[PDB]
Ligand binder design. Structure first.
Ligand SMILES: *Cc1c(COP(=O)(O)O)cnc(C)c1O
Ligand SMILES: *Cc1c(COP(=O)(O)O)cnc(C)c1O
Lengths: 302, 302
């Protein structure tokens, strides 16, 4: 078996200290236990495997893959490209932290640093330029249906089975929209009453009708509504503040032994709010995108 | 289920790029996929659970646990203490990196920084002083039989089953000795011909009859022979150099998509040597103690 085969089948733990007796049960699926360190291993593998199935790619070819990302998707793609023999080029703003660059380069990804003033826009442009110049494959994480399918076929089934089909609400901090859409559809097809609640940064609350903005929940809240996010599935949107989520993340680490990422703090905080609303006999499920390992030099744990 | 329940059941992957056709198969069990980030989650949980079973401890009591370590064992103990409600105090030399200190403190562990000139000796002394002053529980990782038992009851069975009882050699870089002893005994009781090979730093080659010394394989090669290491189980000892292991670790990341720790590079390098000796039709199994996540600021990935 190769590393891509070690993706998924992650555990779900029930919170016991940060919750209160008047709250519904709160379960957290730990996606940080994936070989690539995050939930993005799933869509990274699926988008590449989907491309192979469609004939766009064939493993061990050395073909080029390009994507404008320096986040978990970049790490996941880098891992898969290293394992299956693809040349990966990742475009990103020149102000990228050395720590993250080292992780990507460790996997053999080639990095193209773009105009720091043009932020994501310049990264996207360079990725498109390379796709055109090299005839490369661009996963296109925000609009590729295979992203959603990864969660519809693996994440969703896993969560449903682990919790024995007993879930009253699913809470998640949306990034590309793949997870909430894939898991959301899977759960709604089987649980008539289940509520699907999206979580976003109050500082970049576009789903709530607000405005995009800079925030500290790395990995979630892209500042726009992605094509992979099915808005018709949502039963609500909860806005979260770093001021509330970071202290909660620290509590999870010290009280539950759960050392999670920045987005996890926001997601669990929202899940707790939902848990109090539903009450004692209910079950709230949410997902932790990644662990705290990549964030020791951030205000969350610094 | 709580975090301690998410420990174990780690995957095993077969190397395909760094190996050569004249080599036996090489399988690597990924212990970095544990909630605490390393194989030490197992002995940390077992030593604490063993103490509870013997009546020394009872969860949620706030009882004190003290251990002289800042490594993976410290992280594992911190995670378990946070989850089960114990007060953990870790003693370590004052020259400890801020990164590691942040991980331990994130889990709520109390840190006592000792004389930087007295290295491990001062850390051990303070731990003993606290055990005496507070009547605290000290896991004593290098001599506690529960460490070995964790691997005899979980790691060993898992490896054996995953590889369908087909293993010609087991290779591991010994630290406390728990893993090689536990897995080693489990395998030898079932596979008459299996060879158990220990790996140690050439720079601190005490098992080979050499002398202790400073080295870069964090987590392995303690510079002494621990009580938990059963020397009668060993069929050989392979000495490894950072000069050879670090480049190999980088190859594993770039070619196999396996981003592993410093000790993993040394262990796999040794496993390859054994694989070439055994040849094509055989199977060599080894274990990766942890991932590369905690080592981005080390010469391995910097
Ligand atoms: C990708 C990611 C998310 C969002 O998941 P999507 O399926 O992309 O919506 C949230 N947090 C982190 C840390 C992520 O990497
Ligand atoms: C603990 C550890 C080892 C050794 O395992 P033992 O069972 O203690 O022999 C090797 N490498 C790392 C990184 C470790 O943390």
């Amino acid at each position: 078996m190769r590393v891509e085969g070690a993706i998924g089948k992650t555990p779900v733990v029930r919170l016991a200290k940060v919750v209160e007796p008047d709250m519904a049960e709160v379960w957290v699926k730990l996606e940080g236990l994936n070989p690539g360190g995050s939930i993005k291993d799933r869509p990274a593998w699926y988008m590449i495997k989907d491309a192979e199935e469609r004939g766009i790619l064939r493993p061990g070819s050395g073909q080029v893959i390009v994507e404008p990302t320096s986040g978990n998707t970049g790490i996941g793609l880098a891992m898969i490209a290293a394992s299956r023999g693809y040349r990966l080029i990742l475009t990103m703003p020149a102000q990228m932290s050395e720590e993250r660059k080292r992780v990507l380069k460790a996997f053999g990804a080639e990095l193209v640093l773009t105009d720091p003033e043009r932020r994501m826009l310049a990264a996207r442009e360079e990725a498109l330029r390379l796709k055109e110049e090299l005839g490369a494959f661009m996963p296109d994480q925000f609009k590729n249906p295979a992203n959603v399918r990864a969660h519809y076929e693996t994440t969703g089934p896993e969560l449903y089975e682990a919790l024995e089909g007993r879930i009253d609400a699913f809470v998640y901090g949306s990034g590309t929209g793949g997870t909430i859409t894939g898991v959301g559809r899977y759960l709604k097809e089987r649980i008539p009453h289940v509520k699907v609640i999206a979580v976003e940064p109050a500082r970049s609350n576009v789903l709530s009708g607000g405005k995009m903005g800079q925030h500290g929940f790395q990995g979630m809240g892209p500042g726009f509504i992605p094509e992979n996010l099915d808005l018709s599935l949502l039963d609500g949107v909860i806005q979260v503040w770093e001021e509330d989520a970071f202290p909660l993340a620290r509590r999870l680490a010290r009280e539950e032994g759960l050392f999670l990422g920045m987005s996890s703090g926001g997601i669990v905080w929202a899940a707790l709010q939902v848990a109090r609303e539903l009450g004692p006999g209910k079950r709230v499920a949410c997902i932790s995108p990644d662990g705290g390992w990549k964030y020791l030099s951030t205000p969350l744990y610094a």
